[PDB]
C-alpha cells in the first residue's frame, strides 16, 4: 500500500494549497476592515473551485516565438520539487525515513532556482530576464544563510535525521534554546519564497502558483518541526499530528499577517540586509553554537 | 594592485610550489598545483590590458586541463594499487597520463604552443616569474618518479622540444618570444637526462634559471621588448649591452662560459649509458639557439644602430631603482665553469 500512501500525501497537500488562497483572501480582507469572498459558496468555500475551473478553461497565451522545451519544463520541475519536499517530513512518521533528511531538503531547495532561471530565459524578453536574474540572486543569497542557520541548529540534534528533532524537543522547544537563529530563519524563509516584504517580482501560471503555495506550507511545516517540537506518544500519533498541523497553520497565518502589515524592501536594501546584518550574526552564532555543547558538556548522542 | 595583496599573492605562489616540493601524498601535490595556479593568474594580469587578459585565459585553460589529467592519473594509480604516496607509478596508462600532464605543465613539445603567446602577452616581470619559478614543481615531481618513466616517450618529447625551440627562435623579432623558445629548448635539454641522472637535471635547471634571471633583469633595466628597441641601448648605457652580449654568448653554450657546463655534463652522462646518436643531434640542434643569440648580439652590441634625437634628454637621467643580485647573476651565469666539480653537492 505504498502507492496509497504516496497519493494520500500528495492530494491533501494540493487541496490545502487550494484553500490557502481563500484563507489568505479572507484574512487580508478582515485585517483591511472588509470581508473576503463570501458569495461563491456558503462562506466562500466554493471560490477556489471557481478560480481553478476558470483558469483551466481560459486560453493559454503561448509567446509563439519562444522555446517550448524549457517553457514546458519549468512548471514540471517546480511542482515536482514542491511535492517531493514533503516526503521526508515526520508527522510523526515520514513517508520515507532518511538518514540525511535535512540535507535532502536543502538540495531540493537549491534545485528550485532552475525553474526561475529557465522561465526567465524562455520568456523571450530582456526585462523578464532581468527580473529572473534578480530573483535568482536574492534566492541564492538567502539560501546561504538558511544553510548556515540549519547546521547551527542541528548541532544540538546530533544528526540530520528529521525524526530525531522530535526526540531533541521532548521537554522544551528549540525556540527557547535559540530564538535569534529562529528569527533569522523565519526572515530567510520569507525571502526564499519571494513573500512580502520581499515580493519584488493560465495553466502553467496556475502550476507555478500551486508550487509557490505548496513551498510556503512546506517551509512553515519545516519551521514548526525544527523550532516548536510537538510531544509524540507512540500509542497515539494523532495528538502529534494535530499539534503539528496547528503550529503549521499558525505560522502560515503569520506569513499572511506579515504580508498585510509592512511595506516592501528595495532590491539593494534586502541584499544589504542579508550580506551585512544576517551573515555576520549567523557566523557569530554558528561559532557560539559550535562552542556551547563542548563548553557545557551537552553534546547530543548520535554519531 | 595593492602592494600588500601583491606580496600575499607572490607568497601564495611560492607556498604552492613548496607544498608540491615537501609533500608525500598525491592529493597534497595536486592541491599545491591548484594553489599555485590560483595565485598565478592575477600576477600575469597585474597590468590590465586585453593582451594580458588573453594570456591569462590561455594559461588558465592549459594549466586546468593539465591538472585535470593529473588528477585522473592519480585516481587510476590508486585504482590499480591502494597507494597515495608519490613513488613508482604502478601502472603504464596512469604513468603515461602523468607524464603528459606534467609535460603540458612544463610546456614541452608538442604542448609548447602556449608558452610564446603567454610570454608575449604578459609584462617582463611576469615573464621572469613564469619562466623561472613555474618550472620547479613539475620538474621536482618528474624527478621523484623518474624510475618509472618510459624513456622512449620522455626522450621523444625532449628531442622534439629542442628541435621546436631551435626552429621557432629563428623567426622572432620580439624578445619575449625569443625567451620563450629558448626556455622550450632548455626544458628539452633538462628532460632528456631525467631517465639517467636527476642531478644533471637539477644542475641544468639551476644554470638555466641563473642565466634567464640575468637576461630578464638586463631587459628590464634597458626597458626594451623588441630587437630595434634593444638596438638603441648602446647610445645610453653601453655597459649593459656588453654584459648582455657576454650573457648571450654564455646562453649559447660556448665555452669557457657557464652555459657550456650543463650540455657537457649531460652529454657525458648520456654517453655513459651507451647513448651516442641523441647527444650528437642535441648539440647540432642547439647550434640554432646559438645562431639567433648571435643575431641578437650583432644587433645589440657588436654594431651601432642609428639613434634618435630625443635620446639626448635620456642622457641626463639615471635609473631610480637598482635591481640587487643582477651583478651576482651575471657573474654566476658567465664564470662558474672552473667550479664544475661542485655538482656533487647534489644541487
Amino acid at each position: 500500500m505504498f502507492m496509497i500512501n504516496i497519493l494520500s500525501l500528495i492530494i491533501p497537500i494540493l487541496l490545502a494549497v487550494a484553500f490557502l488562497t481563500l484563507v489568505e483572501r479572507k484574512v487580508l480582507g478582515y485585517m483591511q476592515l472588509r470581508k473576503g469572498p463570501n458569495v461563491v459558496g456558503p462562506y466562500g468555500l466554493l471560490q477556489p473551485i471557481a478560480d481553478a475551473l476558470k483558469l483551466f478553461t481560459k486560453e493559454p497565451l503561448r509567446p509563439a516565438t519562444s522555446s517550448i522545451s524549457m517553457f514546458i519544463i519549468a512548471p514540471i520541475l517546480a511542482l515536482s520539487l514542491a511535492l517531493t519536499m514533503w516526503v521526508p517530513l515526520p508527522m510523526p512518521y515520514p513517508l520515507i525515513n532518511m538518514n540525511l533528511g535535512v540535507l535532502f531538503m536543502l538540495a531540493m531547495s537549491s534545485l528550485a532556482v532552475y525553474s526561475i532561471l529557465w522561465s526567465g530565459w524562455a520568456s523571450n524578453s530582456k526585462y523578464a530576464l532581468i527580473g529572473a536574474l534578480r530573483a535568482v540572486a536574492q534566492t541564492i543569497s538567502y539560501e546561504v544563510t538558511l544553510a548556515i542557520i540549519l547546521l547551527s541548529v542541528l548541532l544540538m540534534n546530533g544528526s540530520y535525521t528529521l525524526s530525531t528533532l522530535i526526540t531533541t524537543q521532548e521537554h522544551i522547544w528549540m525556540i527557547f534554546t535559540s530564538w535569534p537563529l529562529a528569527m533569522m530563519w523565519f526572515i530567510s524563509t520569507l525571502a526564499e519564497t519571494n513573500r512580502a516584504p520581499f515580493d519584488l517580482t493560465a495553466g502553467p501560471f496556475a502550476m507555478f502558483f500551486m508550487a509557490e503555495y505548496a513551498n510556503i506550507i512546506m517551509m512553515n511545516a519545516f519551521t514548526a518541526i525544527l523550532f516548536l517540537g510537538a510531544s509524540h506518544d507512540p500509542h497515539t500519533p494523532e495528538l502529534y499530528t494535530i499539534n503539528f498541523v496547528l503550529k503549521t497553520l499558525a505560522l502560515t497565518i503569520t506569513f499572511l499577517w506579515i504580508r498585510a502589515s509592512y511595506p516592501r524592501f528595495r532590491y539593494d536594501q534586502l541584499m544589504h540586509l542579508l550580506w551585512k546584518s544576517f551573515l555576520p550574526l549567523t557566523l557569530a552564532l554558528c561559532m557560539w553554537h559550535i562552542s556551547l555543547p563542548i563548553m557545557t558538556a551537552s553534546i547530543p548522542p548520535q554519531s | 594592485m595593492n602592494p600588500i595583496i601583491y606580496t600575499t599573492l607572490i607568497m601564495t605562489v611560492m607556498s604552492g610550489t613548496m607544498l608540491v616540493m615537501i609533500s608525500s601524498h598525491w592529493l597534497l601535490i595536486w592541491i599545491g598545483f591548484e594553489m599555485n595556479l590560483l595565485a598565478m593568474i592575477p600576477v600575469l594580469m597585474k597590468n590590465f590590458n586585453p593582451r594580458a587578459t588573453e594570456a591569462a585565459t590561455k594559461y588558465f585553460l592549459t594549466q586546468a586541463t593539465a591538472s585535470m589529467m593529473l588528477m585522473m592519473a592519480i585516481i587510476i594509480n590508486l585504482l590499480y594499487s591502494g597507494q597515495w604516496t608519490i613513488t613508482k607509478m604502478f601502472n603504464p596508462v596512469a604513468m603515461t597520463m602523468m607524464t603528459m600532464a606534467l609535460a603540458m605543465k612544463l610546456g614541452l613539445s608538442p604542448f609548447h604552443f602556449w608558452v610564446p603567446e603567454v610570454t608575449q602577452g604578459i609584462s617582463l616581470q611576469a615573464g621572469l616569474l613564469l619562466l623561472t619559478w613555474q618550472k620547479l614543481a613539475p620538474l621536482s615531481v618528474l624527478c621523484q618518479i623518474s624510475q618509472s618513466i618510459n624513456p622512449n616517450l620522455m626522450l621523444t618529447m625532449a628531442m622534439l622540444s629542442i628541435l621546436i625551440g631551435g626552429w621557432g627562435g629563428l623567426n622572432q623579432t620580439q624578445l619575449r618570444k625569443i625567451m620563450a623558445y629558448s626556455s622550450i629548448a632548455h626544458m628539452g635539454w633538462m628532460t632528456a637526462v631525467l631517465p639517467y641522472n636527476t642531478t644533471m637535471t637539477i644542475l641544468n635547471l639551476l644554470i638555466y634559471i641563473t642565466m634567464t634571471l640575468a637576461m630578464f633583469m638586463l631587459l628590464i633595466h634597458s626597458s626594451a621588448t623588441t630587437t630595434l628597441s634593444l638596438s638603441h641601448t648602446w647610445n645610453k648605457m653601453p655597459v649593459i649591452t656588453s654584459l648582455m652580449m657576454v650573457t648571450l654568448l654564455s646562453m649559447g653554450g660556448l665555452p669557457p662560459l657557464s652555459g657550456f657546463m650543463p650540455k657537457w655534463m649531460i652529454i657525458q652522462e648520456m654517453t655513459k649509458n651507451e647513448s651516442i646518436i641523441m647527444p650528437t643531434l642535441m648539440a647540432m640542434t642547439a647550434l640554432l639557439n646559438l645562431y639567433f643569440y648571435m643575431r641578437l648580439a650583432y644587433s645589440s652590441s657588436l654594431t651601432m644602430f642609428p639613434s634618435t634625437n630625443n635620446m639626448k634628454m635620456k642622457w641626463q637621467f639615471e635609473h631610480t631603482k637598482q635591481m640587487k643580485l643582477l651583478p651576482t647573476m651575471i657573474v654566476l651565469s658567465t664564470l662558474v665553469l672552473p667550479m664544475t666539480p661542485a655538482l656533487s653537492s647534489l644541487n
Binding site: 538518514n99 540525511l100 540535507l103 535532502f104 536543502l106 538540495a107 531547495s109 537549491s110 534545485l111 532556482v113 532552475y114 532561471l117 526567465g120 530565459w121 530576464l129 529572473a132 536574474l133 535568482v136 540572486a137 541564492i140 554519531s303 | 594592485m1 595583496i5 600575499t8 599573492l9 601564495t12 607544498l19 597534497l28 592541491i31 591548484e34 594553489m35 590560483l38 595565485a39 593568474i41 592575477p42 594580469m45 590590465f48
Partner: protein, 126 residues
C-alpha cells in the same frame, strides 16, 4: 544490472553535452549527467557524497554557470560481506577531517580566502 544502466545514461549525457550545442543546452545536458552520477553514488551507498554532489555541484556551480550564460546572449559482486556497526563509515571518514585532516583544512581554507581575493582583483578592471 541497475548500476550498468545508470552508467550507460551517464555516458550518453556526456556525449550529449560534449558536442557543445547552444551552451544553455550543454548546461542542461551536464545537469542531467550530474543527476545520473549522483544517482550512481547514492545507489552505491555513498549517501552523503551523493547529496554533496546534488547540493554543491548542481545547486551552486551549475546554477552560477547558467546565471552567467543567461546574462550573455557485472555489479553487486565486488561488494562487502559484513556490516558497519552502529554508524556509517562514510560519515566517520568525512568527519575525521577536523580531527585527522588539520593540514587539509588549513590549506583548503587558505586557498578559498586567496580565491576570494583573486576574484576581486581580477574583476576590478581598470
Amino acid at each position: 544490472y541497475i548500476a550498468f544502466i545508470l552508467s550507460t545514461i551517464f555516458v550518453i549525457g556526456f556525449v550529449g553535452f560534449s558536442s557543445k550545442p547552444s551552451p544553455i543546452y550543454g548546461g542542461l545536458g551536464l545537469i542531467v549527467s550530474g543527476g545520473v552520477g549522483c544517482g550512481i553514488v547514492l545507489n552505491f551507498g555513498g549517501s552523503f557524497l551523493g547529496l554533496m554532489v546534488f547540493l554543491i555541484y548542481l545547486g551552486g556551480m551549475l546554477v552560477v554557470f547558467g546565471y552567467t550564460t543567461a546574462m550573455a546572449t557485472g555489479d553487486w559482486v565486488i561488494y562487502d560481506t559484513g556490516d558497519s556497526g552502529f554508524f556509517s563509515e562514510e560519515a566517520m571518514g568525512i568527519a575525521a577531517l577536523y580531527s585527522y585532516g588539520t593540514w587539509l583544512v588549513i590549506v583548503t581554507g587558505w586557498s578559498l580566502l586567496i580565491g576570494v581575493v583573486v576574484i576581486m582583483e581580477i574583476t576590478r578592471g581598470n
